[PDB]
Amino acid sequence: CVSNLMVCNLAYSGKLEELKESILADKSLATRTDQDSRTALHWACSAGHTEIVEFLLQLGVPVNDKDDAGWSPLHIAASAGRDEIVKALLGKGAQVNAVNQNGCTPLHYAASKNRHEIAVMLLEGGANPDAKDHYEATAMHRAAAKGNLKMIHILLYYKASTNIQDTEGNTPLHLACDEERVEEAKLLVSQGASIYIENKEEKTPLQVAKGGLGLILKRMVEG
């Protein structure tokens, strides 16, 4: 029991036929909100019930309404890794650059959870690759930190900047160097990540890098 609203519990638990009978008899239940300000769409996205999402979209429910934590269906779908539900929400013009209460866009969640296919769909859908959260961090900061080369290639193909500083003054290259993501550091530098930008501790990526990574990155840029 995730909701005080029956159609939401039906949506979460995947009761397509029951949910369809409830809504078709009372079409206002499709947009009725619960204790978390969630509709049946929000809960169907969370649990991954593609066919219930398709039913609710075919009725013409709004697709951009935020719950009490600022989460849109597209935030929920992206984070829970619902590939087909992301696709359906984008087909109905879900807001790709919507922000929740943490300032996170759906692409922030795609990056932070290595959702390659969802990241591509969001970027093809016009997602801003350089969207900054409340700590001024990007998809690229998460991909670089976590050491996800596939995600770095995707973000670079869709023209993500590599030089945006977070509130601690760190670029994705500082994070790659601090987390000792060697191949990620070299890829970022080969594609224009600055070895000169200083974080709030007045450190370049070279000075954060451990081992011999810093001299390797310096040689790549300066010879």
UniProtKB/Swiss-Prot annotation:
UniProt source species: Homo sapiens
Subcellular location(s) of the protein: Cytoplasm; Nucleus
Region (Interaction with RB1): 1-68, 168-223
Transmembrane segments: none
Signal sequence region: none
Quaternary structure note: Part of transient complex containing PSMD10, PSMC4, PSMC5 and PAAF1 formed during the assembly of the 26S proteasome. Stays associated throughout the assembly of the PA700/19S RC and is released upon association with the 20S core. Interacts with PSMC4. Interacts with RB1. Interacts with CDK4. Interacts with MDM2. Interacts with RELA. Associates with a CDK4:CCND2 serine/threonine kinase complex. Interacts with ARHGDIA and increases the interaction between ARHGDIA and RHOA, hence promotes ARHGDIA inactivation of RHOA and ROCK.
Chain positions of ANK repeats: 1-33, 34-66, 67-99, 100-132, 133-165, 166-198, 199-223
Main subcellular location of this protein, as a coarse class: cytoplasm
Cross-referenced PROSITE patterns: ANK_REP_REGION (PS50297), ANK_REPEAT (PS50088)
GO molecular-function terms, A-Z: RNA polymerase II-specific DNA-binding transcription factor binding; transcription factor binding
Region (Interaction with RELA): 36-223
Cellular-component GO terms for this entry: cilium; cytoplasm; cytoskeleton; cytosol; microtubule cytoskeleton; nucleus; proteasome complex
Protein name listed in UniProt: 26S proteasome non-ATPase regulatory subunit 10
Keywords: ANK repeat, Apoptosis, Chaperone, Cytoplasm, Nucleus, Repeat
InterPro entries linked to this entry: Ank_repeat_dom-contain_49, Ankyrin_rpt, Ankyrin_rpt-contain_sf
Function, as annotated: Acts as a chaperone during the assembly of the 26S proteasome, specifically of the PA700/19S regulatory complex (RC). In the initial step of the base subcomplex assembly is part of an intermediate PSMD10:PSMC4:PSMC5:PAAF1 module which probably assembles with a PSMD5:PSMC2:PSMC1:PSMD2 module. Independently of the proteasome, regulates EGF-induced AKT activation through inhibition of the RHOA/ROCK/PTEN pathway, leading to prolonged AKT activation. Plays an important role in RAS-induced tumorigenesis. Acts as an proto-oncoprotein by being involved in negative regulation of tumor suppressors RB1 and p53/TP53. Overexpression is leading to phosphorylation of RB1 and proteasomal degradation of RB1. Regulates CDK4-mediated phosphorylation of RB1 by competing with CDKN2A for binding with CDK4. Facilitates binding of MDM2 to p53/TP53 and the mono- and polyubiquitination of p53/TP53 by MDM2 suggesting a function in targeting the TP53:MDM2 complex to the 26S proteasome. Involved in p53-independent apoptosis. Involved in regulation of NF-kappa-B by retaining it in the cytoplasm.
GO biological process: apoptotic process; negative regulation of apoptotic process; negative regulation of DNA damage response, signal transduction by p53 class mediator; negative regulation of MAPK cascade; negative regulation of NF-kappaB transcription factor activity; negative regulation of release of cytochrome c from mitochondria; negative regulation of transcription by RNA polymerase II; positive regulation of cell growth
Top-rank taxon, per record: Eukaryota
Sequence segments annotated as region (Required for nuclear localization): 1-34
Summary of the tissues where the protein is detected: Tends to be up-regulated in cancer cells with RAS mutations, including lung cancers and adenocarconimas (at protein level).
